[PDB]
Amino acid sequence: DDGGVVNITYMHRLPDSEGMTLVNDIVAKWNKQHPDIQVKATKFDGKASDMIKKLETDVKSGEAPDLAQVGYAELPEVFTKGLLQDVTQYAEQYKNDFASGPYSLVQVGGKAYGLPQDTGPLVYFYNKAEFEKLGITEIPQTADEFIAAAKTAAAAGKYIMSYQPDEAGNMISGLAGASGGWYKVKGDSWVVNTETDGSKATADFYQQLLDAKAATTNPRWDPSFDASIKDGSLIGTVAAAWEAPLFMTSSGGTGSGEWQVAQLGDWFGNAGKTGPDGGSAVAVLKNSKHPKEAMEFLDWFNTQVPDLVSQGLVPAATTEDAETPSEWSTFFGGQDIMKEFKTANNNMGDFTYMPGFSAVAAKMNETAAKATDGSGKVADIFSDAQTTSVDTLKNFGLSVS
Numbered sequence: 001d002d003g004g005v006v007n008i009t010y011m012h013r014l015p016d017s018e019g020m021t022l023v024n025d026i027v028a029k030w031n032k033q034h035p036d037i038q039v040k041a042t043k044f045d046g047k048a049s050d051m052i053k054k055l056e057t058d059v060k061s062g063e064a065p066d067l068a069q070v071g072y073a074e075l076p077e078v079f080t081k082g083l084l085q086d087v088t089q090y091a092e093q094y095k096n097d098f099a100s101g102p103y104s105l106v107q108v109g110g111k112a113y114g115l116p117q118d119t120g121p122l123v124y125f126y127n128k129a130e131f132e133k134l135g136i137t138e139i140p141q142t143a144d145e146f147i148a149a150a151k152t153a154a155a156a157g158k159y160i161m162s163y164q165p166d167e168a169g170n171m172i173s174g175l176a177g178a179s180g181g182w183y184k185v186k187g188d189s190w191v192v193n194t195e196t197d198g199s200k201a202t203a204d205f206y207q208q209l210l211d212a213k214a215a216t217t218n219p220r221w222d223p224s225f226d227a228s229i230k231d232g233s234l235i236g237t238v239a240a241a242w243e244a245p246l247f248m249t250s251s252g253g254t255g256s257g258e259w260q261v262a263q264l265g266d267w268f269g270n271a272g273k274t275g276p277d278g279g280s281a282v283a284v285l286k287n288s289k290h291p292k293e294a295m296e297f298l299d300w301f302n303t304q305v306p307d308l309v310s311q312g313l314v315p316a317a318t319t320e321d322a323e324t325p326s327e328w329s330t331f332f333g334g335q336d337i338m339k340e341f342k343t344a345n346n347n348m349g350d351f352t353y354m355p356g357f358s359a360v361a362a363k364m365n366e367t368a369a370k371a372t373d374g375s376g377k378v379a380d381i382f383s384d385a386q387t388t389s390v391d392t393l394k395n396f397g398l399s400v401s
C-alpha cells in the first residue's frame, strides 16, 4: 500500500474568472475530506494551445503534474508523443459517471488515458433586441438568407457574424467538420481530406461575409473583440458553448437581458448538425506514481457539476443534470441556455483528430488571418490544412494514403 499521504498535482487551463467557483476552492473541499490524497491544482500561464508544449517539456524534464487538461483534439498528439499513462483499469471503474461519447474520446486503441471533463458544441449567440430593430424577426436558416440579413446589419454599422482568425483552427474546423470528418485510419495509413463539401460551404459563407464587410475581423482574444461587444456593434456570432461566461464578462454588461442562444443555422453545409470546438479531458501523465488516486480524485472533480458549470463547462458527467446559473439566464433574457447546449451536444458530429493537429490548427489560423484584408481566400484555410495535415503525419513517421 501507499504511504498515509499521497500528493497529486493537477495543471488545468480553466478560466477561474470573477464570479466562478475557483478550481482551488473546488479542490480545497476534496483536500479537507481526504487527508490521504492531497491535491495541488495550478492554472497554466499562457495561451491555451501552448499548454501541451509545456507538458511535453515537463514530462521530459520530470517536472510534469500527475494530471493535466488535454483537449480531445490534443489527446492523439500527446499520446503519440509518449506523454500519457494507460489508466484503463482505473477509468473502467468510473466509466458510468460519464456520457459515452466523451468517454470514448479519452481512449486510444481501446486503452484509456484519463477521464472526460466537458464538451464544446458550437452554437449561435445573438442580441434579439438588436435583431428586432433591424427587422430580422427570425434567425435565417439558409446561408443565402443569413448573408442577406448580415448585409442589412452591416449597413447600420452592426455585425451578426464574427470572423475570428486566431480561432480558425478550432472553430472553423468544427464548423466544416459538423458534416464529415477530415481524418480516418484506413488499415495501415491515414486518409486525409480537409476539403469536403463542408469545408467548401464553410469557406463560401465566410468569403461572402468578408467580401461584404459584413463580419467583424477582430481576433477573438484581442481587446478589440471585447470592444465590439461593449460598444454594441457585434450583435451575433458563432460561439463554442463554453464561451457563455467569457462572453458575458467580455460584454461589460452590454445587451444584458437581450442576448439569446440559438442552434447553428444551416450556414456551413452542416445540414442540421453542429460540430466540436474544444472540449477537454484530464489525462494521467506518463510518469505519475499514483494513477489510482489521481483517477479517484479526477472522478470526484469531474462530477462536481454546478462548480464545473460555473467555469462555463458543459460537463461530460451524467451523474446529475447541469443547470443554467441564475446570472446566465439573467444575461440571456431569462433563457435556459443549458438546454440549448445539450441540444447542440446531442446534434454534434463526431470528429477524429490526427496526431499533430496542433500544426494544422496553427496553419489554419495563419491562412485565416490573410483573408481579413482580402489578400487570401477563405478557401485557402482548407487547401493549406490539407497539405499541413499530410506533412505533419509524414513527419511523425506515419503512413499517409
Ligand SMILES: CC(=O)N[C@@H]1[C@@H](O[C@@H]2O[C@H](CO)[C@H](O)[C@H](O)[C@H]2O)[C@H](O)[C@@H](CO)O[C@H]1O
Pocket (backbone or CB within 6 Å): 013, 014, 015, 047, 048, 049, 071, 118, 119, 120, 170, 221, 242, 277, 278, 279, 280, 311, 312
Ligand atoms: C480548443 C481550445 O483549446 N480552445 C481554447 C479554449 O479552451 C477551452 O477552454 C474551456 C474553458 O474556458 C474548456 O476547458 C474547453 O474544453 C477548452 O476547449 C480557451 O478557453 C480559449 C481562451 O484561452 O482559447 C481557445 O483557443
Ligand SMILES: [Zn+2]
Pocket (backbone or CB within 6 Å): 033, 034, 035, 036, 037
Ligand atoms: Zn480519503
Ligand SMILES: [Zn+2]
Pocket (backbone or CB within 6 Å): 002, 006, 289, 290, 291, 292, 293
Ligand atoms: Zn498511489
